[PDB]
Amino acid sequence: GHMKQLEDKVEELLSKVYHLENEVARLKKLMATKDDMKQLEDKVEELLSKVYHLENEVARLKKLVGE
Amino acid sequence: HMKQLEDKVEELLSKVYHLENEVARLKKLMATKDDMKQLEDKVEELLSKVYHLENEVARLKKLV
Amino acid sequence: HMKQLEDKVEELLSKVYHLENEVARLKKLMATKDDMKQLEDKVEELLSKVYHLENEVARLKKLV
Ligand SMILES: [Ca+2]
Ligand SMILES: [Cl-]
């Protein structure tokens, strides 16, 4: 009947909540964070400048070795 | 029996409230694929510049 | 009292459907620990190769 329908709906939801809990637990354990990324970004900012300076230094040497 | 059903529904609502809070915390904290790809691209661009510098330096070394 | 229970069940169903869709979205967007580890290792490669080139360039300059 009507109580039976409501029980059956709540069974469906019980299962859905169980699965959502499992999925969220997983995302939390697998998540790389914004902060982790910013830490690498900061290192890449350093290296960007270093590679540019190296390019300028190698260009100067090439020209020198050129005469 | 209705009480026990009403109790189960309130237990499930409580778990859903906690999940909503957890999801919002995830969204706040998570790095995303697009931004990781942007950074990885920049690293690869730099790695390619370095590989080319390595070859130029080698060549210069053989010239001297 | 059945109406009270029906309305709580409606709150639950609606909130669960919303969460399902949000969790699906986040699964597609969220970069992982493993992804970050691989990018950390690429940046290690880059910083190590930069340092070696810095040394090789300083040496070559002294030689010239
Ligand atoms: Ca490593
Ligand atoms: Cl470094």
Residue numbers in the entry:
A (entry chain A): -1 to 65
B (entry chain C), C (entry chain B): 0 to 63
Give the authors' words.
α-Helical coiled coils are ubiquitous protein domains, found in a wide range of structural and functional contexts. The structure of coiled coils is understood at a level unrivaled by any other fold. They consist of at least two α-helices, wound into superhelical bundles and held together by a mostly hydrophobic core. The seven positions in a heptad are labeled a – g, where positions a and d are oriented towards the core of the bundle and are thus mostly hydrophobic. We find that they indeed break the α-helices to form short β-strands, which associate into a triangular supersecondary structure we name the β-layer. β-Layers are found, also repetitively, in natural coiled coils, where they form regular fibers with alternating α- and β-structure, a protein fold that has not been described so far.
